[PDB]
Every structure is written in structure tokens, then in C-alpha cells.
């Protein structure tokens, strides 16, 4: 859905060069990252996955002393972009797929194993009919 497809970092766009430096994104990644064509490929590079939550996270979102900013990052997402129900659909995959993920050490790539594990899950659900959010805004003048 376009809801969560509206990326916070894309909306912000406050500092491109400083997000570029912060992750030390190689030219190959940040370039492919800017691919505006909706190819819909598999997220293979950690620097891409990380850059998705780079703008609004490097702005301000640290729960603890600097590192391990888990709470505020999820709290920030629930207050801006995804409602609590969507974040709660993600957290479940995050915890289970990351826990069941192979011990291949790449801090940002693990987050990809869970991310793709989520669209895998939603794809297994596949057939889900919507109730249609029909809202009749009755504006009665005079």
C-alpha cells in the first residue's frame, strides 16, 4: 500500500550528503538507491536497507546513550507513517525472522532477512479482501 510506501526519509530529504557520509554509502549503492523506476528487486545491499531509515533517524531518535535506539525508532514510526497496527504487523516478523535468521554477521542485512520475511508472510496470506473505507463527509451548508 502507498501508505507505508511514502518513506519518511524521502519526505524529509533534509541532508543527502550527510546521510551519504554517515553510512559511508559507496557510489554504487546510493546511485542504485536513487533508482526511481519501480523495478521491485530484492534488497541485497545493507547500505540500502540502512539508508531507508537514515534521514529521520540521523536527525534525532536515540532512546539510550547513542547506540541501541530501539524504542524511539519504533515509537517515531508509529507516530509518523505507520499506525500502531502496521508497526505491530512488522514487529512480529522482526522478532521471529531475526531470531530464526542464520548467524551470518551483517548488522544491516539481518534487517533484510526479516523485511523480506514480512513480505513473504503477507504473500502467504495473499487473499485478503478489503471492507472499503467508504466515508461520507456530509458538509451541510447554511
Curated annotation (Swiss-Prot):
Organism encoding this protein: Antheraea polyphemus
Superkingdom of origin: Eukaryota
Drop me one GO molecular function for this one: pheromone binding
SUPFAM superfamilies attached here?
Answer: Insect pheromone/odorant-binding proteins (SSF47565)
Q: Which GO terms describe its biological process?
A: response to pheromone
What does the function comment of this entry state?
A: This major soluble protein in olfactory sensilla of male moths might serve to solubilize the extremely hydrophobic pheromone molecules and to transport pheromone through the aqueous lymph to receptors located on olfactory cilia.
What is the annotated tissue distribution of the protein whose record heads this document?
Answer: Antenna.
Q: Which SMART domains match?
A: PhBP (SM00708)
**Family under the similarity heading:** Belongs to the PBP/GOBP family.
Q: What is this protein called?
A: Pheromone-binding protein
Amino acid at each position: 500500500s502507498p501508505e507505508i510506501m511514502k518513506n519518511l526519509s524521502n519526505n524529509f530529504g533534509k541532508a543527502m550528503d550527510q546521510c551519504k557520509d554517515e553510512l559511508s554509502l559507496p557510489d554504487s549503492v546510493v546511485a542504485d538507491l536513487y533508482n526511481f523506476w519501480k523495478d521491485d528487486y530484492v534488497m541485497t545491499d545493507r547500505l540500502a536497507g540502512c539508508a531507508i531509515n537514515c534521514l529521520a533517524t540521523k536527525l534525532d531518535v536515540v532512546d539510550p546513550d547513542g547506540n541501541l535506539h530501539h524504542g524511539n525508532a519504533k515509537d517515531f514510526a508509529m507516530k509518523h507513517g505507520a499506525d500502531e497496527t502496521m508497526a505491530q504487523q512488522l514487529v512480529d516478523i522482526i522478532h521471529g525472522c531475526e531470531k530464526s535468521a542464520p548467524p551470518n554477521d551483517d548488522k544491516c542485512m539481518k534487517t533484510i532477512d526479516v523485511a523480506m520475511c514480512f513480505k513473504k508472510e503477507i504473500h502467504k496470506l495473499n487473499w485478503v479482501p478489503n471492507m472499503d473505507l467508504v466515508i461520507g463527509e456530509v458538509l451541510a451548508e447554511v
